[PDB]
C-alpha cells in the first residue's frame, strides 16, 4: 500500500502547466497555502495574478504537468498593523472596486481570516460572489476602499441545486474560526472554494 514519500509542500512556491480541456497548456505560478485535513490530496493555492483561491489535487490531477516545487522562500513578513488586521477578522465589509471604465463598484462581503503563509493577505468572500478570495486588504483599508460594518460540520457532504436545473455534491472542508457557522466547501469538478453559512 506504499506511496512515494514527499516533502510537505504547504508554504512552498510552485509552478506547473495545466492542460485545458481540448485546449492549450497554460502556465501557473503560485503559493501553496494549505493541505486539507479531511482530504490530504487537496491543496489550497493562491496563484499570482488570480484573485480566487483554488483547490487542486496537485500530485494526483492528470491535467497538472511539469509540477515544480521551487526553492523560493516566501518572506516571513511581520504584520504592520496587527491590531487593525486582527479586528477586521469576521467583520462584514463594504469593499470598493473599480470597473473597466474606472467607475466605482462596491461589493458587500466578509473578512474570514488572515491567509496562512501569505499572512499580509486576507481570506474574504462576497455576498454576491460566495467563493474564497484573497487580497492585501490593509492596503484597501488605508486607501479608504474598505469600510467595516458593526460541533463541526467538516467532513460532511452537502448537495447544492445548480441554477441550470441540476444538482452537485461537495464536502465541507474547513470551518472559519472567527465565524464557526461559516464553512468552506469543495465540489467535485470545480476548483473554487465555496463559502457558505451552514446555520
Amino acid at each position: 500500500p506504499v506511496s512515494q514519500p514527499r516533502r510537505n509542500i504547504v508554504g512552498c512556491r510552485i509552478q506547473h502547466g495545466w492542460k485545458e480541456g481540448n485546449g492549450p497548456v497554460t502556465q501557473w505560478k503560485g503559493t501553496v497555502l494549505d493541505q486539507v485535513p479531511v482530504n490530504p490530496s487537496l491543496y489550497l493555492i493562491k496563484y499570482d495574478g488570480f484573485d480566487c483561491v483554488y483547490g487542486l489535487e496537485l500530485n494526483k490531477d492528470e491535467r497538472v504537468s511539469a509540477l515544480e516545487v521551487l526553492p523560493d522562500r516566501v518572506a516571513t513578513s511581520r504584520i504592520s498593523d496587527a491590531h487593525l488586521a486582527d479586528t477586521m477578522i469576521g467583520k462584514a465589509v463594504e469593499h470598493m472596486f473599480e470597473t473597466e471604465d474606472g467607475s466605482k463598484d462596491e461589493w458587500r462581503g466578509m473578512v474570514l481570516a488572515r491567509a496562512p503563509v501569505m499572512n499580509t493577505w486576507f481570506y474574504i468572500t462576497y455576498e454576491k460572489d460566495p467563493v474564497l478570495y484573497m487580497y492585501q486588504l490593509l492596503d484597501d483599508y488605508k486607501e479608504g476602499d474598505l469600510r467595516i460594518m458593526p460541533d463541526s460540520l467538516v467532513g460532511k457532504q452537502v448537495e447544492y441545486a445548480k441554477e441550470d436545473g441540476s444538482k452537485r455534491t461537495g464536502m465541507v472542508i474547513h470551518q472559519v474560526e472567527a465565524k464557526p457557522s461559516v464553512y468552506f466547501i469543495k465540489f467535485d469538478d470545480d476548483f473554487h472554494i465555496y463559502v457558505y453559512d451552514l446555520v
Partner: peptide, 8 residues
C-alpha cells in the same frame, strides 16, 4: 481601488 477580475 482594485480592478475586479470579471472571470475566475
Amino acid at each position: 481601488a482594485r480592478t475586479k477580475q470579471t472571470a475566475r
